[PDB]
Amino acid sequence: MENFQKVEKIGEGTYGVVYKARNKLTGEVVALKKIRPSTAIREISLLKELNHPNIVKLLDVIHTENKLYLVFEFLHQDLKKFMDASALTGIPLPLIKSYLFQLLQGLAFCHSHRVLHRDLKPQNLLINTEGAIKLADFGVTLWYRAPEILLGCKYYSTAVDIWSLGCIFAEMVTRRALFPGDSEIDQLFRIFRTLGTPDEVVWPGVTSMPDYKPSFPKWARQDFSKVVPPLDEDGRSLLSQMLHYDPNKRISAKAALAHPFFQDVTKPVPHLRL
Numbered sequence: 196m197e198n199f200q201k202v203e204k205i206g207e208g209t210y211g212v213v214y215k216a217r218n219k220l221t222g223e224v225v226a227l228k229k230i231r232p233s234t235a236i237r238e239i240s241l242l243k244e245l246n247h248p249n250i251v252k253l254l255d256v257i258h259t260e261n262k263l264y265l266v267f268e269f270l271h272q273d274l275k276k277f278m279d280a281s282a283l284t285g286i287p288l289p290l291i292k293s294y295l296f297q298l299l300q301g302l303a304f305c306h307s308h309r310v311l312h313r314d315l316k317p318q319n320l321l322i323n324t325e326g327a328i329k330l331a332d333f334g335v336t337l338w339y340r341a342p343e344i345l346l347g348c349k350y351y352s353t354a355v356d357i358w359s360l361g362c363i364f365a366e367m368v369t370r371r372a373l374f375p376g377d378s379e380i381d382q383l384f385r386i387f388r389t390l391g392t393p394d395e396v397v398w399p400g401v402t403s404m405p406d407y408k409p410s411f412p413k414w415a416r417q418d419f420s421k422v423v424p425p426l427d428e429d430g431r432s433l434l435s436q437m438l439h440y441d442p443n444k445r446i447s448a449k450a451a452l453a454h455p456f457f458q459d460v461t462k463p464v465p466h467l468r469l
């Protein structure tokens with residue numbers, strides 16, 4: 196702190212509190228996160244170089260008085276608050292599609308540098324007046340969690356981010372969370388009831404996962420047409436590939452960018468009341 200005046204609390208993150216603050220030198224308005232190892236130090240410092248138009252810029256890491264503060268580019272609103280704000284008519288599809296396309300771009304970036312987010316969720320997704328959307332708060336909600344994580348895979352891949360983003364995608368379209376678990380088992384079982392209990396056909400190796408049980412109930416898959424009306428056939432094809440059980444079949448961000456759903460992408464501006 197010190198060289199930064201807290202203007203307000205804007206969140207109580209996973210790894211600490213987030214403040215809007217103003218730099219007493221630069222004059223600059225930033226987002227200041229107070230965290231709470233040399234290893235936390237080295238991976239954090241790797242973040243400072245992961246720079247992309249769809250990634251919140253990490254301005255500075257202050258390791259001082261034996262505390263950790265992260266200084267971030269300030270954005271004025273997150274996608275959760277924009278969703279609650281837009282619930283009556285919903286986010287216009289060209290806006291949903293621009294948002295998805297840019298997040299795919301951020302993820303294409305991170306993933307090509309072997310960085311996973313691990314915890315995407317509408318609250319970590321930040322928006323500006325210019326129509327941009329950025330990824331923040333890189334890795335108690337269970338809702339956007341990939342099923343390989345829920346099944347206890349320890350060495351899971353970039354495909355987890357693709358799964359979270361498809362859940363966010365579906366949520367923007369229907370104005371309700373795709374899979375609102377309130378426990379890990381409820382989360383897993385909600386995924387199962389919509390998509391089918393997975394098996395060796397759709398996901399080789401699933402019955403050998405650590406937390407998999409033969410006693411899991413055996414639900415049938417519902418059809419996507421019922422899951423996210425009124426997403427068009429392109430949107431639905433893409434969403435279906437983002438939600439493949441097998442993380443190895445699940446579409447990449449780079450491949451998803453080439454999907455015909457984006458043939459007509461544009462960059463609308465949202466109407467944001469700050």
Ligand SMILES: CC(=O)Nc1c[nH]nc1C(=O)Nc1ccc(F)cc1
Nearest residue numbers: 226267268269270271272273331332
């Ligand atoms: C976690 C993190 O890095 N957050 C941020 C970085 N820049 N801006 C933020 C942030 O949380 N901005 C908001 C401002 C106002 C809101 F209502 C919500 C988010």
